């Protein structure tokens, strides 16, 4: 369910971001999505452990 969260970006759908935005701003949108999903995965791995 964490896939549908925007994490403060433009949109949750990744292909929409890559198909609507130039790489100068797609870089920071990608960065925000990566850090949000990486934090979620870190929490999941800690709870699983």
């Amino acid at each position: 369910k964490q896939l549908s969260s925007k994490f403060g970006a433009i949109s949750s759908v990744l292909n929409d971001i890559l198909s609507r935005l130039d790489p100068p701003e797609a870089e920071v949108q990608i960065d925000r999505l990566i850090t949000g999903r990486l934090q979620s995965l870190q929490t999941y791995v800690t709870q699983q452990l």
């Binding site: 433009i10 198909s19 935005l21 130039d22």
Partner: protein
């Protein structure tokens, strides 16, 4: 949107959210167009926030 460049040379044309190059592939609905005149130095005031 190919008729935009054929009218006049633009001043700023800075775009937020979507790039002003890949505007012929994404699909959406119900655009909104508003028109007014600004006295030169306050064009940058027409911006989010």
């Amino acid at each position: 949107y190919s008729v935009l460049y054929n009218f006049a040379p633009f001043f700023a044309f800075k775009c937020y959210g979507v790039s002003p190059t890949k505007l012929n592939d994404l699909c959406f609905t119900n655009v909104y167009a508003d028109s007014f005149v600004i006295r030169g130095n306050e064009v940058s005031q027409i911006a989010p926030g």
